[PDB]
Design a protein around this ligand. Sequence first.
Ligand code: MG
Ligand code: MG
Ligand code: MG
Ligand code: MG
Ligand code: MG
Ligand code: MG
Ligand code: MG
Ligand code: MG
Ligand code: MG
Ligand code: MG
Ligand code: MG
Ligand code: MG
Ligand code: MG
Ligand code: MG
Ligand code: MG
Ligand code: MG
Ligand code: MG
Ligand code: MG
Ligand code: MG
Ligand code: MG
Ligand code: MG
Ligand code: MG
Ligand code: MG
Ligand code: MG
Ligand code: MG
Ligand code: MG
Ligand code: MG
Ligand code: MG
Ligand code: MG
Ligand code: MG
Ligand code: MG
Ligand code: MG
Ligand code: MG
Ligand code: MG
Ligand code: MG
Lengths: 172, 172, 172, 172
Amino acid sequence: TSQVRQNYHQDSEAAINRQINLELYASYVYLSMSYYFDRDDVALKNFAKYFLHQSHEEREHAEKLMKLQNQRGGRIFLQDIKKPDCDDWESGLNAMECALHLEKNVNQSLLELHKLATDKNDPHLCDFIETHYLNQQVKAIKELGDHVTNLRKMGAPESGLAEYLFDKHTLG
Amino acid sequence: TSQVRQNYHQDSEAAINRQINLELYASYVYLSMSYYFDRDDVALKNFAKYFLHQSHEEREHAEKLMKLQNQRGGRIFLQDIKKPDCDDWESGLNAMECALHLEKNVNQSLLELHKLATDKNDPHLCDFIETHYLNQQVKAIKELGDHVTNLRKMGAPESGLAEYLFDKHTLG
Amino acid sequence: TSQVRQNYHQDSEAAINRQINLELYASYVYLSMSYYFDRDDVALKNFAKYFLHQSHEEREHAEKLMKLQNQRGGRIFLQDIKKPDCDDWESGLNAMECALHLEKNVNQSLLELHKLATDKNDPHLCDFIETHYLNQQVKAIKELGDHVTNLRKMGAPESGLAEYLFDKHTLG
Amino acid sequence: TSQVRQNYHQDSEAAINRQINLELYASYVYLSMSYYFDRDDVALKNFAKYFLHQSHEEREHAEKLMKLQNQRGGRIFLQDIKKPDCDDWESGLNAMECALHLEKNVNQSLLELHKLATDKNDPHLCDFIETHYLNQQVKAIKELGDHVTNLRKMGAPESGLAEYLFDKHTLG
Ligand SMILES: [Mg+2]
Ligand SMILES: [Mg+2]
Ligand SMILES: [Mg+2]
Ligand SMILES: [Mg+2]
Ligand SMILES: [Mg+2]
Ligand SMILES: [Mg+2]
Ligand SMILES: [Mg+2]
Ligand SMILES: [Mg+2]
Ligand SMILES: [Mg+2]
Ligand SMILES: [Mg+2]
Ligand SMILES: [Mg+2]
Ligand SMILES: [Mg+2]
Ligand SMILES: [Mg+2]
Ligand SMILES: [Mg+2]
Ligand SMILES: [Mg+2]
Ligand SMILES: [Mg+2]
Ligand SMILES: [Mg+2]
Ligand SMILES: [Mg+2]
Ligand SMILES: [Mg+2]
Ligand SMILES: [Mg+2]
Ligand SMILES: [Mg+2]
Ligand SMILES: [Mg+2]
Ligand SMILES: [Mg+2]
Ligand SMILES: [Mg+2]
Ligand SMILES: [Mg+2]
Ligand SMILES: [Mg+2]
Ligand SMILES: [Mg+2]
Ligand SMILES: [Mg+2]
Ligand SMILES: [Mg+2]
Ligand SMILES: [Mg+2]
Ligand SMILES: [Mg+2]
Ligand SMILES: [Mg+2]
Ligand SMILES: [Mg+2]
Ligand SMILES: [Mg+2]
Ligand SMILES: [Mg+2]
């Protein structure tokens, strides 16, 4: 057993490894979305920039969990990073809707992780999740909701003009 | 009687208390409007910013009247601040129309206050109203009229695109 | 149901609306206290400044809760802001005692809100309350306690000199 | 008749000359008060500074009225500047009370002047009085009221300590 380990349940250790994989998966989804908008037949450069930034943020989220695993004396166990659900994302609106779904799924995982940490009476882990993950998720979900609403109200996905102008005004 | 009181009719004192309440009410209306546009299903951040600024301005208007009451030796009497007429404001255009109606109502109250001050031969109070309130109201009403006109001409409220673009170009 | 809503109980939503009203009420109490000390027959300008600052802080507290409501996909429901308990606050000491009572009441409401959030297993809401409200309340209560103690020890409310000197040294 | 004179009643011209004398008288009262506090047996240097500043302000008030008289094509008529009512002012509190009485008397004169200007349909003169005199008077009266209140509450005039500390904290 690690010389640093204290009050860190094996179930929590395992759950943190699962969360690391999920964050990496989220980074991969956003990477794929980014380059969809870089296609010559889609060509929305600010959608591409927005999603690439999100992808880099998720990689940071994964790294912080790997750091946490080591800080607590757990051992990192990595799994394959699954390819994203979709190859073709259809429209800016559709990609934003996929992102919203993804972030709500990640949030659910984090809430399940918090429930476990609470059940195992691990207040350090609870605080870690609360401080570095929960409000970040709420902000991300709210922002994606805002984006979806604006695209819908503007006439997306039918209106190519709507997605073009959203690209310039909101994401530019 | 206050050692500072001079040429300040009890009717004017009472009217100033009523105006304080009205200014606070106006601040509350604009606060409510602001956060309507912050909803994930409305999501017009510059409408939200615009109305929040207006709300803060009305609170300043109320404070200046409270200061005036004390300067003249009257006594402040506060009443409940009523909740705004509407919870749901429908659209950017509708909120602007509500604001226009509100500011015209506040203007009418100020004109009635000025008539009273004139009738009681209180030139200090007349000058106070004229200097700090009347042109501010005329400018606010004109600006809201301008906003309503632009939103209508652009195709609001039916056009979600119109409200989106107005949010960026006029309020951004 | 809001596209952003996740793990946010209707009871929590309602409690947040109640808290918004309470914060606005607290802003109103402090506004009234501020202008009491601005009266020509009270004339303690630093008491007035202190309470006006507190009033503005409470308005910020209310706005942050309105922001939270929208972030979580709840819907803001506003109620009348009740006028403060007292019109005449008697002395600096009495106003400080009223403020202490108010802040302890607001704290109790926040603790009840936290209990609800805990019961509904909402760790994001728990963290929000803990981060933005609980220590702020403890600091405010401690500061008001300190102020009350000093005024008492100095000879308030009988000693007009005590309140005058406290105004200059502690609040100035 | 002056080549510049227009809509300027002879009664208004005369009233402006009377006001010039009153402003000069007020400057003289404050000059006398100032040097009372400079006496070795009174020795409150900030009371002395405060009243000397007030004296200089009144001289400016008189000059602006002399300027107005010429701007409108009236002719300045000067009278003796009467010595102040009191030679000995007793205490800081008593001097502040005398100043309050003086400023209320000057205010009454200005209100009478405004009534005359209104009766003679002279909106330029009304605006001049409103802009340069009326709120200045209200502020002065309020400030003197505040000062009187503080000195009383502190224990003046019996307490030499009260007047000493007021000199340092409020006027210093
Ligand atoms: Mg895994
Ligand atoms: Mg993100
Ligand atoms: Mg993440
Ligand atoms: Mg192991
Ligand atoms: Mg596969
Ligand atoms: Mg914590
Ligand atoms: Mg935080
Ligand atoms: Mg937004
Ligand atoms: Mg542009
Ligand atoms: Mg009222
Ligand atoms: Mg405004
Ligand atoms: Mg207003
Ligand atoms: Mg009364
Ligand atoms: Mg009602
Ligand atoms: Mg005027
Ligand atoms: Mg003006
Ligand atoms: Mg315009
Ligand atoms: Mg454009
Ligand atoms: Mg309520
Ligand atoms: Mg505070
Ligand atoms: Mg608060
Ligand atoms: Mg509902
Ligand atoms: Mg009631
Ligand atoms: Mg926390
Ligand atoms: Mg903290
Ligand atoms: Mg302390
Ligand atoms: Mg004369
Ligand atoms: Mg002066
Ligand atoms: Mg003068
Ligand atoms: Mg002549
Ligand atoms: Mg004589
Ligand atoms: Mg007029
Ligand atoms: Mg004018
Ligand atoms: Mg002015
Ligand atoms: Mg004052």
